[PDB]
Amino acid sequence: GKAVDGNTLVLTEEFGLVKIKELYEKLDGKGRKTVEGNEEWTELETPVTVYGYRNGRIVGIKATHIYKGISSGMIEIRTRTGRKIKVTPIHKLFTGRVTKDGLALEEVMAMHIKPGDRIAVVKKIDGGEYVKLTTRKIKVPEVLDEDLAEFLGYLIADGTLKPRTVAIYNNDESLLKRANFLSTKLFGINGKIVQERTVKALLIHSKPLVDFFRKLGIPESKKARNWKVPRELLLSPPSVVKAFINAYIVCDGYYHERKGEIEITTASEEGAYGLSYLLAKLGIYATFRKKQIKGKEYYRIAISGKTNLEKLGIKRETRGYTNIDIVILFDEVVEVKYIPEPQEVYDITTETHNFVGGNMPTLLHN
């Protein structure tokens, strides 16, 4: 059938950005299940909200069924932006061609895709509401607002969790003082700025505060390689996402003045992919590259061009708000790989017959 590889990420409201195989395993049997030969599916008792294309926007839509099957082979497609999707050969992709007279859209089976073709990718994801967070003493924020998203950006970029201490490592004391101010405003407690052997740090000693961030999904070990974007951020308004993104960039961003691009490099591959979804909530299209640096693999997210970059600014021309985005772009295929080995594949049935997935946001078809 038409299906995708199990490692394909899918954006969901309930679980955040999750591999479709893990979504399947979580929901397998929660509804009316049918097994027919090598195929199986569950009609979900309650649909799961994913994202899809409806009336010119990418919005939350209902997925009613989850499906697991087998395919004899697969097609793996890589694009110029660094998207890489692995799908069954009959999986339908939406392409765009630049012609004599203009732009032509048609559906094309993955097996017929060639380098030079351009597939539909998502530039802008709609939605987002202030997320309610369910509850010595601290105050626990009740909403994920811009202040908490900014603090989360410092913590995810440059911070660690230990059982008794929330730490931020950064040589810019003004940044540490801003994080400390946010700690006082948000949690009612503050920390101390310390000179450590390698870097300055702000240390906040509070087991309840650590527990707060643990509950948000910040890892306590192997954080550099394993952090993920919290599902609460992926459900947040664009202004909250932007506070997080700008805080991250302040910590780790570089600007190439001649390429005109902001670059961040992370050791977390799934973290990098989550950042691309957060950027799409802002209407920013990013590029992704793996880089081998000093004998290790890192993950580079880049933001290029005045249209992208101006959306990060705190001061913006007022039309930037009235100019409503175009939501879909067409991304050039650079490599196609034909994979004869059979494997399990997965699908989700939605009311639009499409959904948003891939390592960076891509329009996929049922």
- For 88-139, the DSSP string reads -TT-EEEEEEE-SSSEEEEEEEGGG--BTBEEEEES------PEEPP----P
The string of DSSP letters for 308-341 reads: HHHTT-SS--THHHHSPPP-EEEEEEEEEEEE--
Q: Based on the number of CB atoms within 10 Å of its own CB, is 296 exposed (0-12), middle (13-18) or buried (19 or more)?
A: exposed
DSSP state of 141: P
Measured CA to CA in angstroms, residue 181 lies from 144, 158, 178, 191, 279 at distances of 17, 17, 5, 9, 26
Distance CA 252, CA 148 (A): 18
Question: Is there a contact between 327 and 88 (Cβ–Cβ < 8 Å)?
Answer: no
Radius of gyration of the chain (CA): 21
Q: Let me know: does 51 contact 364? Beta carbons within 8 Å.
A: no
What residues have CB less than 8 Å from 94, skipping those under 6 apart?
Answer: 105, 106, 107, 119, 120, 363, 365
Which helix (H) or strand (E) element contains residue 16? strand 16-19
Resolution of the model in angstroms: 1.9
Q: Going by C-beta distance under 8 Å and a sequence separation of 6 or more, which residues neighbour residue 146?
A: 239, 240, 243
Closest to 363 in 3D by CA, of 123, 126, 128: 123
The length of the chain is 366
240: Cα separation from own chain's centroid: 15
Cβ neighbours, 10 Å, residue 263: 18
| Distance, CA of 113 to CA of 329 (rounded, Å) | 17
Question: Are 4 and 344 in contact, with CB atoms under 8 Å apart?
Answer: no
Residues 361 and 335: their CA atoms lie apart, in Å, by: 18
Q: What is the DSSP letter of 204?
A: E
> Residues near 230 by Cβ (< 8 Å), separated by ≥ 6?
16, 152, 216, 217, 218
Asked if 301 and 44 touch (Cβ cutoff 8 Å), the reply is no
Task: Write the DSSP assignment of 20-34 as a string of letters.
Answer: HHHHHHHHTTSEEEE
C-alpha separations of 147 from 3, 182, 315 in Å: 41, 7, 18
CB-CB contact of 109 with 89 (8 Å): yes
CB atoms within 10 A of CB 259: 11
Distance in angstroms (rounded) separating the CA atoms of residues 265 and 298: 7
Q: Which experimental approach was used here?
A: X-ray
The separation between CA 300 and the C-alpha centre of its own chain, rounded to angstroms, equals 14
State how far Cα 258 lies from the chain centre: 27
Residues 49, 62 contacting (CB under 8 angstroms) = yes
C-alpha closest to that of 362 among 3, 43, 53: 53
Amino acid at 66: I
- Please state the separation of Cα 67 from the chain's center in Å: 23
Q: Are strands 328-339 and 287-293 parallel, antiparallel or unpaired?
A: unpaired
Q: What is the DSSP string of 289-315?
A: EEEEETTEEEEEEEEESHHHHHTT-SS
